[PDB]
Amino acid sequence: GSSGSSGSSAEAGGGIRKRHRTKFTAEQKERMLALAERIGWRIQRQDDEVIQRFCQETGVPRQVLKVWLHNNKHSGPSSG
């Protein structure tokens, strides 16, 4: 096939907008925290299924789920 929509996979280097006005609630917060503590505050082509999936249960954008970790980890509201 391939004709209407362009090949999804082509280039790696991405970057769509910056962390917009987010409002992670105890849910999203904890959700990510539990994820970060699950994936390792990291992202891989393996956890993708989880990353993307988690975005289905939460709704947070990957790009956010990424920076978030950074916006969280490395000095911040650390509890666990």
Count Cβ atoms below 10 Å from residue 60 Cβ, excluding itself: 19
Other C-beta atoms closer than 10 Å to the C-beta of 73 total 13
For 51, the domain range is: 1-80
> What's the CA gap between 20 and 74, in Å, rounded?
20
| C-alpha distances in Å from residue 73, one per residue of 1, 60, 64 | 43, 17, 13
Looking at the structure of the chain, the number of domains it has is: 1
* SS3 (DSSP) at 32: helix
Token match 């992670």: residue? 24
Which method, experimentally, gave rise to this model?
NMR
Neighbours of 67 (CB within 10 A): 14
CATH code of the domain in which 60 resides: 1.10.10.60
Beta carbons within 8 Å of 74's beta carbon, 6+ residues apart:
none
Query: Cα torsion at 61, 35, 48, 60 (round to 10°)?
Result: -10
